[PDB]
Amino acid sequence: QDEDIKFQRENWEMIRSHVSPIISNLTMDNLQESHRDLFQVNILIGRNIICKNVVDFTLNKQNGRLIPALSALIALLNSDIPDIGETLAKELMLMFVQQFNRKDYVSCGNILQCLSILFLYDVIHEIVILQILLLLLEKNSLRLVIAVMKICGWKLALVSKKTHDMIWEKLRYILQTQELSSTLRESLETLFEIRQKDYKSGSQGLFILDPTSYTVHTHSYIVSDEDEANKELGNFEKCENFNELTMAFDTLRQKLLINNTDVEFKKKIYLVLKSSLSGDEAAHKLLKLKIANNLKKSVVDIIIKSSLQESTFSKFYSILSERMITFHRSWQTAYNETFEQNYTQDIEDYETDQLRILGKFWGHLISYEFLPMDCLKIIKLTEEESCPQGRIFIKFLFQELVNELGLDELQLRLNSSKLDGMFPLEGDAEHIRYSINFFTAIGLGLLTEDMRSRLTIIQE
């Protein structure tokens, strides 16, 4: 048996060296990762190692902010292994007694916060909390009573409304009839504001795991004067049950592993459109439908296709779209991507009549900035990246732009916008030649002259 004990002497340190940095670096953000990484070593023997690490975690002065994370981890570990919570309810309680005997209230604050949050998780019984509040009030250390009450008073009022309303009649008698110091006074009055309007608002900001994520195991302890904190907690203990402990840990680990792992819509929208006299009415009806964000693009597609069924363009569709766009940004982005969808994929399926309607429609929305002119960045006037459908579309779009804005305003809006794909000021010369050809041949050559200066330089 000597060889087995020697092996255990090494296994204990293996567990210690693996679980110590996990606890020492615990945070509310990485808690789940720490919880799963704890179970990759046999924790059923390392119960005492974890408990000693938790006690050291609460004693650390800087870890006051991270106590809720530690409490949630203790709750998870207690649900998987009740003995951890069993021994913590005693060791943290005795540690608080000790640190209160030495009057180091900074660490007492951490222990009381941890115990209160454990109370919120039903890891510890109410008895522990009422003993702690008896011990603090027989000394009149209100600064800790107030801190404990902010966190757990609302549960203590459900569980022990008798003693809870005694502690309130004591606390209020102090506030109303005793010569308090200001920093104490304003913290007591803020505890009264909390009870007055939202008694749970003292445990809002902590990390709160839902009750589904753990199983309730409640442990209790009664503090006697003879009892002393185990200063040798976490030291090696002979493990006569090593094999069965490993087998049980196998079952627990595999438990953790297994536990961790439209024609009618088109019709509806179409009928909304066809039942409306004005674009404002149609827009109102569609907005009142509260269409989900993922369906908005399909709605815009239905509006476009409906407008493409008409014999001509109609201001009705432009007003409708405009009202949708200005209502919310999700509609503006749905229209943006529908425009690039049309030019990139759908134009090949459109006949020249449909392209005429579509060009005028998008030109109208661009001419009023409902669709930003930056959307034209997807246009690439070249013999390879464009097709007759796209060029016919561009022709009608720009014709609408010039009809609504005039040459001067269109020229100024294009100049203030980077459109290298239509007015290449740099790059291959034949892209400049082809662009000036397109724009002059559609009659927009006045826009081209500025560009031609480069075309002339290219000849020399």
Binding site: V263, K267, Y270, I302, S306, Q309
Partner: peptide, 14 residues
């Protein structure tokens, strides 16, 4: 014979 307004199919079907 069935009238045209019955025979014709709304765009959203096709």
């Amino acid at each position: 014979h069935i009238p045209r307004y019955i025979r014709n199919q709304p765009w959203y079907y096709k």
